[PDB]
Structure formats: C-alpha cells, structure tokens
C-alpha cells in the first residue's frame, strides 16, 4: 500500500507485464496491462474500482488520484521500470499529439512492453501521466502519449 | 493466472538522469478502442 512505483507481474515462471503507481492508497495502471483483473499484493488483494478502455486506464482500491499535467514547455522524466532492471529516470522534452479534442504531450521513447504503466514526472516529482499507449512513426519509432486520468 | 505487484522504487525526479529522445509534433486520432492512429 506504500506510495511508489510497482512492477505488475504474472505467472511456470514469472513475467513482467507492466508497471503502476501507488498514491493515496490507490493503484494506477494502464487497462491494456491488466485488462482490469484483480491484483495480488503480498497476502492482500486489490480490486478494480474504475476503468476506461478508451483512456486505457484503470484504478484499484479507489478513484483515480493523479491529476498533474505537462506544462507544455518543460522537460519531463520517464521513471522507467523495465523488466529485469532497476527503476531508472529518463529525461526528455515531450513532443505533441494534436487531436480534434486538443493536444496531448507525447514522449519519443521506446522501452520494452513490460514498461507500460511507468509514470512520467514533472520537475516537482508529480505524476503527469503514464507511459505505454501511443503510435508508430517512420522506421518503427514508437511515441507514447502522456496518458493522464481525471481526478 | 496470478497477477501480482512488487514495489520497485520511490516516485522521484533524479537530477542526474540520462537525457534523450526527440519531440515530434504528430496529428493523431483516438478511436473507441483506445488506439491512436496517424492522421493526414
Ligand atoms: N474486472 C472488471 C474490470 C472493471 C469493469 C470495467 C472497469 C474495470 F476495469 F474496473
């Protein structure tokens, strides 16, 4: 239940399917990581509380708590938790997804799929969204939206 | 299928982070299934 970034694992052996954020007693990850299934945490169970396929987000134990947003000018850090690797910070200036409904920050970083759900942070350390829903440009370069929910 | 979580770190900015990646500006659409696609 401790605040932090967490691996999401599945079981023969174990595999890391994604990443999520614990904040204010609520676990935040991407829908495509868990498909809304319940999660084990030690001897306890975390049940899904809210989710939305179009936003590709799900929260456990309570409503979505993360509400900070990219300021549109400043560099950010992806707190990547790749399978088999220590959590590490990658700093970048986001590009932009321009959509009919407005602009979304986007990071042109390509990490293994099990990194989906890793938080993207602003300079004050607030989570401005999660990594791992995006689009491919030319030469197989992946670009991830900075996906944020509503509090 | 046991899905479970393991803590991996604090949520902190790191002053000494590796810096990389471009900042592309892309026109995109988001469909009902949550999939982004390019638009021209
Ligand atoms: N395990 C069921 C998944 C639920 C119902 C839709 C939203 C949700 F993901 F929380």
Author numbering:
A (entry chain B): 18 to 28, 31 to 170
B (entry chain A): 49 to 88
Task: Provide the authors' original text about this structure.
The protein construct contains the soluble part of the membrane bound NS2B co-factor and the protease domain of the NS3 protease/helicase protein of the Zika virus. The NS2B–NS3 Zika protease is a heterodimer, the NS2B co-factor wraps around the NS3 protease domain and forms part of S2 and S3 pocket. For soaking of the NS2B–NS3 Zika protease crystals 40 μl of soaking solution containing 0.1 M sodium acetate pH 4.6, 0.2 M ammonium sulfate, 24% (w/v) PEG 2000 and 5% (v/v) DMSO was added to the reservoir. 0.4 μl of soaking buffer was added onto each dried fragment and incubated overnight with one crystal. For the second fragment screening campaign LigandFit and PanDDA were used to identify binding events. With this campaign 18 fragments were identified as crystallographic binders with a total of 22 binding events.
Here, we present two crystallographic fragment screening campaigns using a 96 fragment sub-selection of the European Fragment Screening Library (EFSL) provided by EU-OPENSCREEN. The performance of this subset was validated in two fragment screening campaigns using the model system endothiapepsin (EP) and the NS2B–NS3 protease complex of the Zika virus. EP is an aspartic protease with the catalytic dyad formed by Asp35 and Asp219 and has served as a model protein for finding inhibitors for other aspartic proteases like β-secretase, a key target for treating Alzheimer's disease. As a second and real-life target, we addressed the NS2B–NS3 Zika protease which is crucial for the viral life cycle of the Zika virus but with its shallow active site challenging to target.
